[PDB]
Each structure stands twice: as C-alpha cells, then as structure tokens.
Amino acid sequence: KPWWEDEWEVPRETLKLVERLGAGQFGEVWMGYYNGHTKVAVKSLKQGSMSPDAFLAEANLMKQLQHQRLVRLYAVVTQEPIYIITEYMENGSLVDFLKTPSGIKLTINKLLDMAAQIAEGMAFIEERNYIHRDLRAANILVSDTLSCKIADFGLARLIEDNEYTAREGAKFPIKWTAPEAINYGTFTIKSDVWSFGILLTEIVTHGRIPYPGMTNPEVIQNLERGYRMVRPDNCPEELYQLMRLCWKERPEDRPTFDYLRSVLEDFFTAT
Numbered sequence: 001k002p003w004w005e006d007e008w009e010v011p012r013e014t015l016k017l018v019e020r021l022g023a024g025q026f027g028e029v030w031m032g033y034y035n036g037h038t039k040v041a042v043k044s045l046k047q048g049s050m051s052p053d054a055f056l057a058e059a060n061l062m063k064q065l066q067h068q069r070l071v072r073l074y075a076v077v078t079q080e081p082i083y084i085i086t087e088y089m090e091n092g093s094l095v096d097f098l099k100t101p102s103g104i105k106l107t108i109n110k111l112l113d114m115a116a117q118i119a120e121g122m123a124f125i126e127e128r129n130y131i132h133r134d135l136r137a138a139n140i141l142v143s144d145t146l147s148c149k150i151a152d153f154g155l156a157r158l159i160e161d162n163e164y165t166a167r168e169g170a171k172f173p174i175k176w177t178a179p180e181a182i183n184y185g186t187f188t189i190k191s192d193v194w195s196f197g198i199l200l201t202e203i204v205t206h207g208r209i210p211y212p213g214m215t216n217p218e219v220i221q222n223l224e225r226g227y228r229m230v231r232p233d234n235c236p237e238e239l240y241q242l243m244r245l246c247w248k249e250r251p252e253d254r255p256t257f258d259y260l261r262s263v264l265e266d267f268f269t270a271t
C-alpha cells in the first residue's frame, strides 16, 4: 500500500526529536513530540547500516499487532532518514527500571502483577499466530503508571504452520533461548514461553543476568543433564515451579501464555 496513501506515513515536520535515549549500529532512538503536544519515541535508521526494507518490516509487522499490552505503532517516515514513531514509554526498559529507586521499592505483589501483564501481552501474540523470539526484560517497556508492554519486534514473525526455522548460521542469546531454537533453529510460541520463564527470573531478581555463575557452555551442559536454574535468591517457591513448567524438555509440554497469565493473576491477587 503506497506511501501517498499510507494512513501510517507522516510529514517529517510533524515531529520534534528532543532527547536521544540510545545509539548503536543500526541508528538512534529519540523521545520527541508529534505536532507539538504528544510525546513519542522515534527510531531512525543509520543509512547504509542495514536495509531500509528490513528496518521497516518491524513497522509493517506492528501494523498487524495492536493491543494495549503491545507498544503501539504511531507512524512512519519512509525517506531521507527513515523514522519509526511509536507510543512513548516513560519508564524505559523493565530490566533498567527494576534497578532504580522506584523499581527497588516494588513489592513482590507488584512484580507478580507486572509479570502477568507481560504474559497477557504474549497471550495476544500467541493467539494472533505470531512469535516474538526476543523475549527478555530488556524488551519489555514500562509506562508512567507502572504498566508493562511488549517491545522490540526485530525478530517477531507470523507463522503459516507452527515452525519458523532460522538460517543455519544464526546466533541468539543463549541464556534466554530455548534448546531447540539454539540447536535446530526451530522457534514456536513454546520457545517464547521458555524465555518468558527466564524473564520471570529477571523480574524477581531485579536486574540480574540469569544462571548466576555460569558461562554459556556451562549453562548448556547443565540443561542437558536435566537441571534448571538454581532458585534465584528470594524467589517465591510457587513462581519458581511456574518457571519450571516454562522449562519443560519438550515444547508441547510447555504451558500456554493464557494459562501463565491466568496463574500469575491468582498469585498476584492472592497477595
């Protein structure tokens, strides 16, 4: 659908980049304002660093995935430097927010709350037939009202039938990704469940890097023995047994996202 017809295309004028939130290889992210008043986040592609068609595939997938628990596509600018504009999240990434004064004061109740918002957001992704493939505290975003939404959809995909198989030479963060995804390059909403498992460990330990004293090969060798992550310090035994269904050996034994939500709501209100 062409750009002079795209309901998503905006004149670049309408925008005003104020504070750079970050920079890397692929460009920059900025808070700014749309037509003066509405706070937004703007991702800009560093020319030449990656393909504009691949930059925008994120935007195009988000056009299809709209739900309160998901960070919302506002608009795109599809020339000079290419912009992706979204809804603004005031409190930045979950993984950082959990380390701040405010984050550090959160009760376990509040945390189990947030965890259920994330599972909700994924129960949508689940049911629309998408997979995320990058689910971790760094790719959860926090609002001014301490709610949570799924972010970063770089790797997110619609599936015809259950399997998405990566290209043989692909690497993903070992500590967060499911054995079959690391090994066979096969991803399903069940892989994402496994990661969610790992993210639970990030919520409940605030910041921390999962599998505390272990290198990647040590972490692989342990899984293969039938071990899983050592009960994080101060992790209610319940939520741990939950991470444990998230880490079942066979994916089809791994639970749904709707069910995780369901359970996380009980844990939450039971406290």
Ligand SMILES: Cc1cccc(C)c1Nc1ncc(-c2ccccc2)n2cncc12
Residues within 6 Å of the ligand: 021, 022, 029, 041, 042, 043, 058, 071, 084, 085, 086, 087, 088, 089, 090, 092, 093, 141, 150, 151, 152, 153
């Ligand atoms: C702008 C954008 C483009 C594509 C995909 C997404 C998820 C976003 N949104 C954001 N992406 C990134 C950030 C962000 C980046 C660094 C630090 C904190 C926030 N952000 C903050 N509020 C909204 C965002």
